[PDB]
Amino acid sequence: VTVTVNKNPSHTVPSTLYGLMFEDINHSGDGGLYAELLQNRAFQQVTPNTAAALAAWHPISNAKLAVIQDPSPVSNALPNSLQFSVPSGSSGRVGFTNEGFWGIKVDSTWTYKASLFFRFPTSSSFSGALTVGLQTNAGRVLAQNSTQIRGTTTKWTQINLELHPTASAPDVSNSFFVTIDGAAGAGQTINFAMFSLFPPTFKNRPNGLRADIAETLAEMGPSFFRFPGGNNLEGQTTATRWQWNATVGSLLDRPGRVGDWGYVNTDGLGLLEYLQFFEDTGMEPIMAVWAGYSLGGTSLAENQLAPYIQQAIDQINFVIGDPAKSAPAALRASLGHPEPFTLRFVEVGNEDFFAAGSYPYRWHDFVTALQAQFPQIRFIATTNAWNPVLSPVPQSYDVHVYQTPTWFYQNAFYYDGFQRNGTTYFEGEYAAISTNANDLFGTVADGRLAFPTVQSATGEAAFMTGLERNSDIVFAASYAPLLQHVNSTQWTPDLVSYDAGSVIKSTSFFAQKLFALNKGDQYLPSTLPTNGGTLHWSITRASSSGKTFIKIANAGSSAQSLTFQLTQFNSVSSTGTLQVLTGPETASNTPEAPQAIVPKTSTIGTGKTFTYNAPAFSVSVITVTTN
């Protein structure tokens, strides 16, 4: 096919076109991006005196363990404690382990920070060392540190000890441990609370993020980060919704919450940790506020909304307000960040198309209040576009789609026929999830993708060429979900996967990275792809340099050739770069073969006329200079 490139751009490509979508799903927060290594670290939101309350914790030797509603808790936000007892007649190390989130990576080049709170509930004559450390799951110590404690310590007391492993471990089958000498400790009971173990963090931020995952997200070149959900914003009930203020301040004051994916969230990954990560990566937020609906189907009545509207104002003031003018902004300053963070976009709810009978009044009352407080913020509606009809008129809508790979190439013209009437569109969740059009949310045996494939990435890439062509009205787009702990999965496929030690970059991750890192600020019209065809492209240009990015998706099973005609330009470079992602249709990166499918980069001859043979199932980027 001949592709003629117009020398005259038609529109500016928004800085926000490509970004990330985050909620805590598949242990993407706790167990994932958040660097904490201990699972169930503070017994949050579990029932005392049950096996489930002891999840992740195990005795060493003859230790007796129980999670209690402490009569004197470390904080009222953390009402549960681990009650540890050593039987009479004991000797040798006695204590307990935490298995982590399906393991702990033990690396000799890392310093770890361990901490805990303890008290003796009944004063005793105990005198001895409290040892903390890392061990193999077979019981051999890889790192330890200790401090002397006394049974007269009846007040809650924090222990802080660094760890330096004697060796990296051969695998991630390791645990954190706490022990005392069982002879010195025979007959003792100690209450513990608020444990923590951190590795080094991204940008050395206190309470920060896991380095390999954070670096992988930054590798993609995202411009925005949509958070904190997604379904995990909503709660099952009003009482279980995400609340910003429960996520800020000391970990001693963060109660945690049951999220929407079967597990407790610590809320250690809280609003300030999110915002610091944005600052550290150059991303800007698309921040959601809770909007009076939760996933059990209850909408708050209109006459109940006012306190929740104020909570959303408070959330936004934490991000951007002048510290002198509100308590939430003063709080941000008190926590070390007096400057406002960037915030241009706020999303009102999540997927309110499921609660469209109430969204008109919820949207009206939230946005009337929030826009008057923040005239400069753009508010994004979450119902289906234009049905129901909202007041005030939304400036933006968030569109979500989960579909087959084929649907994505077939629907690359989704936005071409939309009106240009001032509305912009955020494709806030999309992914090709299954080959079974009639059971998209089913099992792997019925066509669900366990991991992205070449097929799914290439169909997505064809749809993304349409997002980019239509970027006069499409301002932002993010794949979902972003992250997956391969040992605790609630949804597939996911963009980036990991276990306790390593990261897997999917086929779809490479398509996202190829699009985001090779994106100009000018859109150059070209011959249109066939509407419904397998072969699609989009051309952009960097105004400052003339770097010109030709992105090509062949989402079908046969090779196709393209003859590029750039004769309208004054000059085109004699060489260009080529980046190609391709492989078998159903190939994936997996924990067993994590680099099965990776892009290949080369240099090729170009000029005002050149030809490219696009392999079956490929995503390609050709970069030339034009003027």
Ligand SMILES: *[C@@H]1O[C@H](CO)[C@@H](O[C@@H]2O[C@H](CO)[C@@H](O[C@@H]3O[C@H](CO[C@H]4O[C@H](CO)[C@@H](O)[C@H](O[C@H]5O[C@H](CO)[C@@H](O)[C@H](O)[C@@H]5O)[C@@H]4O)[C@@H](O)[C@H](O[C@H]4O[C@H](CO)[C@@H](O)[C@H](O)[C@@H]4O)[C@@H]3O)[C@H](O)[C@H]2NC(C)=O)[C@H](O)[C@H]1NC(C)=O
């Ligand atoms: C920018 O441009 C867009 C596109 O033109 C404008 O979008 C239109 O907005 C109006 C509201 O302002 C929508 O009107 C409502 O239409 C429904 C009937 O919907 C059905 O028929 C429509 C054709 O008339 C059709 O477009 C619809 O298709 C959509 O939904 C289906 C799936 O549902 C989907 O398959 C399509 O892809 C579309 O997503 C649909 O089949 C009607 O019932 C409404 O009437 C109620 O509301 C009015 C006003 O309050 C009231 O007077 C009535 O009494 C009644 O209570 C209403 O007329 C129209 O659907 C939108 N079109 C599309 C294509 O989305 C948009 O308004 C522009 N914005 C700006 C800022 O100018």
Ligand SMILES: *[C@@H]1O[C@H](CO)[C@@H](O[C@@H]2O[C@H](CO)[C@@H](O[C@@H]3O[C@H](CO)[C@@H](O)[C@H](O[C@H]4O[C@H](CO)[C@@H](O)[C@H](O)[C@@H]4O[C@H]4O[C@H](CO)[C@@H](O)[C@H](O)[C@@H]4O)[C@@H]3O)[C@H](O)[C@H]2NC(C)=O)[C@H](O)[C@H]1NC(C)=O
């Ligand atoms: C995150 O922030 C949200 C707000 O955005 C917090 O949620 C709000 O929490 C408050 C406090 O729980 C709550 O206000 C109460 O509503 C109660 C239920 O209606 C009222 O009974 C209660 O009034 C009593 O307490 C006030 C002090 O809080 C008094 O000043 C008032 O006179 C009442 O006093 C009676 O009761 C108290 C015991 O509560 C007793 O000591 C007195 O002697 C007297 O008998 C409050 O007004 C809001 O309704 C919540 N709002 C929303 C939107 O959820 C949330 O708790 C924060 N999370 C964290 C972790 O801090």
Ligand SMILES: *[C@@H]1O[C@H](CO)[C@@H](O[C@@H]2O[C@H](CO)[C@@H](O)[C@H](O)[C@H]2NC(C)=O)[C@H](O)[C@H]1NC(C)=O
């Ligand atoms: C045991 O933990 C303590 C406390 O973290 C470690 O001491 C710190 O060591 C660092 C590195 O030298 C110093 O910068 C701090 O000033 C020390 N703090 C205190 C309170 O002493 C100690 O190194 C650890 N020991 C082992 C064997 O890991």
Ligand SMILES: *[C@@H]1O[C@H](CO)[C@@H](O[C@@H]2O[C@H](CO)[C@@H](O)[C@H](O)[C@H]2NC(C)=O)[C@H](O)[C@H]1NC(C)=O
């Ligand atoms: C976490 O998931 C990983 C990846 O699936 C598991 O490791 C695989 O385990 C199977 C069965 O033991 C082996 O046949 C594979 O070769 C393993 N793959 C890799 C890449 O190591 C791991 O066992 C899981 N961890 C837990 C604790 O369940």
